[model samples]
Target chain A: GDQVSKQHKAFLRKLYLAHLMDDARHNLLSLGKLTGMPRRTLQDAIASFADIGIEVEFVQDGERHNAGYYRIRTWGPISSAWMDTHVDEVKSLLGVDDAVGQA
Target chain B: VSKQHKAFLRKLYLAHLMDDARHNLLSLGKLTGMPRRTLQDAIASFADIGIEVEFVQDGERHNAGYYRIRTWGPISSAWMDTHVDEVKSLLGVDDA
Candidate 1:
């Protein structure tokens, strides 16, 4: 009755990453540059986002043959409006500063 | 760097590529003093060990790209962070 819930804690990270992908383009290198998470952790987090209905895909660009950014194609079970409303809360909970090196 | 030493260099390179340093071939060359082909070889062989490295290009068309360690496959990253410098010393790199 007092606050809105994320339903699950793990979803917070997946949702945060989903929103981040929505904001810009990235792979693990840039994502690591931004998030400070190790390669393995970021790799798993992106892979796991699909489990919760947030499907992120590596949409290639620039004709580099094997180069692309991770883009969220399907929201599945959430909406940008809901995420925007709770963005600050999720950032606060996860200690994510969207302004620092945020693209 | 011998047979297994070369293998160690792959993991070392993987850790370096996926590191916060966000090294491209140029920066990795700056750090390691290795030739571009050697660095490319190391990056390419990560797949033989089951690790996948992804090359991501920025939206620009003038060749802004970086490597992403797509998955650990069968390795450990936390351990790599712990022992990065140790292997550097073993490989005779002089950087701190």
Candidate 2:
């Protein structure tokens, strides 16, 4: 595949991740379960989110030791409403299942 | 400009380089005065625009060959041909 196709995939992944989080907090395991994406890919996605105007942060859980979850603080350029409408399409493209099924 | 827009310009520069080089990576590097690694990266990025680049090995030398643009997916090669100068300017490769 050419760079454009690869870049497109990266863009889609970022957008999809932002949509899934939707200004909420999610743990790595839960995100992995929701998207069927590996832990490494999710970590990389979080790191690259700044390039696309998505803000993500890790927040520690007060009750647990070293327990934390990732949160999507903002979705820049990409519209949450639009993403909500395209949830099915995003899921299909990413090859992930809806919440009910195994990713 | 936004990062995404800058990325698009880089892609356009690559497309222009590919079209001008006639798929020859060596010639592209020499013509653009870009390092070999940069040329390789730009070539690798051709997939972003749906361009397919393939290396045709030279029988006499191992791993020595020229590249060929097998396909220019959704982009118009002719357009790139005409806009080479503009792309070069935008990418700051005009002197090269």
Best-fitting candidate, scored by lDDT: 2
Error of 2 at B90 (Å): 14
Compose the digit string of candidate 1's lDDT tens values, residues A1-103: 2232333345567767777788888887777777666788778778776554466888885677975789887764345555666777767766664335665
Q: Write the per-residue lDDT of candidate 1 for residues B1-96, one digit (tens) a residue.
A: 355444545555455556665668887777777778977877766654335788788777577687887765434555566666666766665332
In order, the first chain's TM-score in every candidate is 0.75, 0.76
Task: Provide the clash count, candidate 1.
Answer: 0
Note the B-chain TM-score for every model: 0.80, 0.70
Candidate 2 local lDDT, B1-96, one digit each (tens)? 556545655655666565555546667666766677877777777665356778787777776577777865444566556656665766566334
Looking at model 1, give its docking quality level: incorrect
At residue B25, give the lDDT of candidate 2. Answer: 64
What TM-score against the true fold does each predicted structure earn? 0.43, 0.48
CA lDDT, every model vs. true structure: 0.64, 0.65
